[PDB]
Symmetry: D2
Subunit: 377 residues, 4 copies
């Protein structure tokens, strides 16, 4: 795939043509076991599988990276990377990370990993955070959920590498269509492929994309031992969804922009959060590192109880997750951030009436009409 552009690699990356039969779509390798005398690289499915390898080759290609490793889930990918941090070492992350990531951070702390939360949006926040001794890993999620703030990956990576730390970007929100963490200076891109990469809300998966060969050996050794491998049929569905990733993301972004303007015009809407708004507090950073501002929107609803707003949607689905072809709506205080106390949410800037939209690929006018009907301004 040398010289081929992004949209071509989506279709042909890892597409091994089939010797003898010539299948355009590679066959699905379900076998757990391999005949030793018929080859000698394939021994057992937990360690080796061609369908899985083809997906990894495709993902790596999307970032022009030498390596990728896929997992049973996004959580499993994060767990694997975090497992490389030793007791006594430090991970610096931000406060507002994905609840699952925080869940993993809690597990790591109980094994003696130091987790330090920080403000990575200011020079003083960054300097303070990276002053931590034995700093092993800087964990960046950008844009963040659900307030959609962004962290300057290139700048944090520069400062972090001065301290000898590894930098990972959870790039699930943006996808490699919109953001290229390795090109920005990060060491690892982390994905829940469950979201926009597979894109059809019908399979779980995770991925790490990176360039370091020692990291590659460590990641592969842990996956084989921990056994957090995806099934071949799952890899097939992720790979199949991947073909249309740039098509889907481009449509989702265009519709999100339309919905943001509807929200700004509604009398029952307060603050509107979107990386693309000119008045976004980190607009220069968004423009510098995202080719488009994404398909997630959040806003403060002023018109009455959030539960009633959620009940009025007839096209948007009320549920968690994001990135899929079906548009979704949730209220973080009632759903994704319900386990937190009201005081914890207040401290994080997550109001009771904050609403989050994940824009799918439905007709933008249908989505706009459903939103207006629900808002009932």
């Amino acid at each position: 795939m040398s010289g081929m552009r992004f949209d071509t690699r989506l279709v042909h990356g890892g597409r091994r043509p089939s010797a003898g039969t010539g299948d355009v779509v590679p066959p699905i390798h379900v076998s757990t076991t391999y005949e030793r005398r018929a080859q000698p690289r394939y021994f057992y499915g937990r360690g080796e599988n061609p369908t899985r390898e083809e997906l990894e080759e495709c993902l790596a290609g999307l970032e022009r990276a030498p390596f990728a490793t896929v997992f049973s889930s996004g959580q499993a990918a994060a767990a694997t990377l975090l497992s490389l941090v030793r007791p006594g070492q430090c991970v610096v992350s931000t406060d507002d990370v994905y609840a699952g990531t925080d869940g993993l951070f809690d597990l790591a702390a109980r094994q003696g990993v130091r987790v330090r939360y920080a403000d990575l949006t200011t020079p003083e926040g960054i300097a303070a955070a990276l002053a931590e001794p034995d700093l092993a890993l800087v964990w960046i999620e950008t844009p963040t959920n659900p307030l959609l703030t962004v962290v300057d990956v290139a700048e944090v990576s520069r400062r972090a590498h001065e301290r000898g730390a590894r930098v990972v970007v959870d790039n699930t929100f943006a996808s490699p269509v919109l953001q290229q963490p390795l090109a920005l200076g990060a060491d690892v891109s982390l994905y829940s492929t469950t979201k926009s990469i597979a894109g059809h809300a019908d399979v779980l998966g995770g991925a790490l994309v990176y360039r370091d060969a020692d990291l590659h050996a460590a990641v592969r050794a842990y996956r084989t031992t921990a056994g957090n491998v995806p099934g071949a049929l799952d890899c097939f569905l992720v790979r199949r969804g991947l073909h249309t990733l740039s098509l889907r993301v481009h449509r989702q972004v265009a519709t999100a922009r339309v919905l943001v303007e509807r929200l700004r015009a509604s009398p029952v809407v307060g603050a509107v959060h979107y990386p693309g708004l000119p008045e976004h507090p980190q607009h220069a950073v968004v423009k510098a590192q995202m080719s488009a501002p994404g398909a997630i929107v959040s806003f403060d609803y002023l018109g009455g109880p959030a539960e009633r707003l959620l009940d009025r949607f007839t096209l948007f689905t009320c549920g968690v997750s994001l990135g899929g072809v079906h548009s979704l709506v949730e209220c973080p205080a009632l759903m994704t951030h319900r386990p937190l106390s009201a005081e914890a949410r207040a401290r994080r800037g997550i109001g009771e009436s904050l609403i989050r939209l994940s824009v799918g690929i439905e007709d933008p006018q249908d989505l706009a009409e459903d939103l207006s009907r629900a808002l009932a301004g």
Copy 2:
């Protein structure tokens, strides 16, 4: 899905709620049999299946039609419709029809059906064609393969209905994104969903979309008896591909236009066939019945035997079929001049495809 626009119907058409569990993507119904005391519409998988029905509901909705029936393949859909023509009756069709369709025509002829091929692009061709006695079915493929000629569906349908005949359009090439045969006056839209509807070259399927309730009973009776039904996992894959149909088709068309301009400037290219060219012999009809001119292109290669060109592609795949995410190239005569080449445009980067095409031609 009333009031919902096309792209919304692609995502939510037939997206039946799961009571209790609340699944957004409906679960895949693989069971061949059903407990009778637990219900009473479902008896046996060949007759009834919820996953298959959801796909049919989606397809019917894309044409705002009351009925759709899916099949194990496009050929099976065609066979089913053709089975309704009785011995002694006549089918009139476009001359360049799909070889499989012609294969079916040969079978029908051996059953006492009269098959007549005709030029349906002229008023004289149509009048001559539709003068056949016992005319039961007019079989229109438009645009045609591989010269991409176009037939006026509304006009042929008007004349055919005066003779009481049924009109089917094989709408595989254009897809319902670009052409709406029922809205143009046809009685049936026929699809190989194997091509652009499923779109990922990993499943076979067919479909009929139509409005007549008597036709519906006959089509379903034949499918149940002949058993040319698709599997549930196949319906799942077709339905999954359908979500992105308008995304894929719009991209394929945009890139086809880019390739056509590259072809027109190549000195080893002669005639270029594409419904979107201003000088296309039926361009007025294209503008009237297609919302965009499609993703299939054909052209005369002047540089020698087609094999010389075909061996040089490094991104296009040399193989048959069309409509998929992977770009395909073939020589119809090998796989209509000896050096006529047909392109099926996929969703790769247009500049990569244009470079591969230019490299092969040079």
Copy 3:
């Protein structure tokens, strides 16, 4: 697979090695299209598919036959075979065929095929039946549904071939574990693989198994033109179920014998139909052509409306189809008026016997 016994062929028949990777289970070929320059037998999925071919090789091997062809369903396999009969020619069939088969016979008749139903259990029935002019096909279902009548395949085949007719046996009920129609002299074995061959009630399929090369060309030409091909994922599920076919059938038969003993001892049961009973009117034929008497049983219920009996089962499932791991019960007249049919699954025989007894009570 030469020299390998039946149970081995179930596991390794058509199990083509994967060059390079060495997969023990062959990978699933979903691709509809093939690169021409990368080979040249594979052009398009409706015509050619390695996963489908592997299943066909396995099925042919189970009857030591050169050819097999699989289809989207048992009905499609039957329809394909029926398409070879010309208007004006005659098909002779057993009177007790599958309802779907009767549906196909009606379709064929509306195209000018003559269908004659006959008693193929007596010498006079056979002689009368096979006297039809232009006899093209003799259609044997044995044991029959739902009365479990049995037809002597070797004898009918002998007489039919004298008349130049082709003989097909619908071998769905028995499966190739219990009955081998080609070895008995028939020309074609027909299967709904939907039933015991796939065995898990989760995929539709059909198959024809035969030896004639001209028939092969005709069958494949029709399948390609009619497009009644199965998908690769479906072929995968059928092939996967096939591994355990003899294990499942042996268990089902053993349990069926226990249930038959229960039925015969019930005061609310009249006639009991089962090929293995000494008093079955064709028991000598059963002993000569079936290695075991099958897993299907039917009987007359005398205790009241069939619906009342059906409602009382708590383990048997009330539904159509047969051959699967789940035991099924149906009333043919609703789905004599009081005839009940059992399809025995692989549950514990004592659990199934208790359920049947509670229901009859």
Copy 4:
């Protein structure tokens, strides 16, 4: 499934009715996301946490051991990793010396987290010494062992371990719940690679834990959700589908293994033959007390020359690792997976015809 016998539970365990349509085989729930307003009782939020197809498989597995809980995983390793994650810094795990290589791999990781791992001989009243360890949290029993097929008395070790307050897990992958019931024997957890005989068709990876403790249940589910080592729905469907025929396959495999053992005992190029069913097996009394049949794994010392040459001669047995599937497998632990001689050979007996398998084995042993 109350009152139903084992073979019935294989077919109907977890076979949840489909409201409205009445599907006999439950539909495959592939959706990762769930509509919140569509649930009378809100149980499904997100696929990593909840999935009906996965739950039906778990319900079936739990039912096979008459246990209240089961949890399935992306692999056997992931099931083991989950259980091992619950051992805290400062605590001790005691294990059978000859454990599965992957289990040893996990033990190495745990040791780097401040867990003390002690290997022991649990076949002799070895047990007392082993269980004298301070802070003993977990006793890890694999029985029969691989590849020498020695057996550990589960009830006895469980008795001694519980006096010390330790948890007892049995890796029951080799025997399967058809032949051995660790929870009925006194253990706290049954651990499976369902990749092997439970799925049985060598076409899906999976793992499982089966247990009774509700506090354990909460911890195991919390870890699986956070670590994300969950299986896909299509994989659960394939494991569940394979499970239907589990007792049929195992009974056949055992019968054929007994035939092969007799063939092996008659060979001039075979030394020691290892099989739990042999009368002279050193733990024969324990085998009879805790296994309903002696299993489908056989190993033996090959005396005829280099093992690599022997492996090349099989034409029906497949040379490869893993076990329990419908296809018979052969390996040489010293050359492949690993008192294990250079010429020790292990057979995993499949469901092929016993006479075909015996002839292939005899042909390979004879050479020529």
